[PDB]
Amino acid sequence: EVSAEEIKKHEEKWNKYYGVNAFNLPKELFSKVDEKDRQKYPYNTIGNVFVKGQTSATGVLIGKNTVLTNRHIAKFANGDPSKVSFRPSINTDDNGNTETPYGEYEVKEILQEPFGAGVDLALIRLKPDQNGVSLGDKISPAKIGTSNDLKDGDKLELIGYPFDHKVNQMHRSEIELTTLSRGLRYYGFTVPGNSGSGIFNSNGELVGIHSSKVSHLDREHQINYGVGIGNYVKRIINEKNE
């Protein structure tokens, strides 16, 4: 139970992201990442996780051949690697020209829920290209930080592929942390394709992975939910990363 003043204020904030048309959102809160920035860190660690005829979401290169995304996204492949593809820094302009600067990678193995079924993260291991060159040799993986020092009110950058808005176009979203007692919760503009989007701090460190929207305050309102790279998650990543 929370005061009626909260639901009012929550609705106030929420609405500044979802009350106006996506295209009408202020650039500071949501914007397309241009070509120049796409070639730089941390943007180039972001890729599109494509599951043939199932979904198109986001993933973060955290290892030489490893991509961190959501367990719910990975489930769409039913343990079958041939069904998933990873396209780092893919871009399709409004005129259908698609470019994949580092190529497209095949998956050799899906670790569906290495952190437990109630933690929405999965690891995707990639094959190197046909020359045996790993994606992580072409691009430096994201630096992994920690979510331990984050606090209510913090502002972070969520980077991903908002499919439902624009196909294969990397966008950044400013997010605002809120009641962190109930997991990584935040205000910000996202759509289903942002699932698996990286959340970075001012130091360029990966501190969380976007998951979805969950009920908040009461059963009738929403907030974005993400999985923070906490002590436990960090440990499993150090153990299985590659």
Identified catalytic residue from 85, 134, 195, 197: 195
Beta strands in the chain (DSSP E): 30-32, 46-51, 55-61, 66-69, 84-88, 91-92, 98-99, 105-111, 122-126, 143-144, 155-160, 171-177, 184-187, 198-200, 205-216, 218-228
Which residues, including other chains, have CB under 8 Å from residue 210's CB and lie 6 or more apart?
A: 58, 158, 160, 190, 194, 195, 196, 197, 198, 199, 224, 226
**Whole-Å CA distances, 61 to 44, 79, 156:** 9, 20, 19
Q: How far apart are CA 83 and CA 98, in angstroms?
A: 20
Angstrom distance (rounded) from CA 56 to CA 87: 10
The Cα 129–Cα 81 span in angstroms is 15
Indicate the resolution in Å: 2.0
Question: Which of 53, 115, 47, 58 has the alpha carbon at shortest distance from 82?
Answer: 53
Q: Which domains, and CATH codes, for the chain? A: 1-46+142-229 (2.40.10.10), 47-141+230-242 (2.40.10.10)
> Is 195 assigned a catalytic role?
yes
Whether residue 34 lies in the annotated active site = no
Q: Among 10, 120, 165, 210, which one carries the catalytic annotation? A: 120
Q: Distance between CA atoms of 37 and 125, rounded to whole angstroms? A: 26
Q: In this structure, is the dihedral angle defined by the CA atoms of residues 158, 198, 95 and 139, taken in order, positive or negative?
A: positive
CA distances for 78 relative to 47, 110, 234, angstroms: 21, 9, 25
C-alpha–C-alpha distance, residues 196 and 200, integer Å: 13
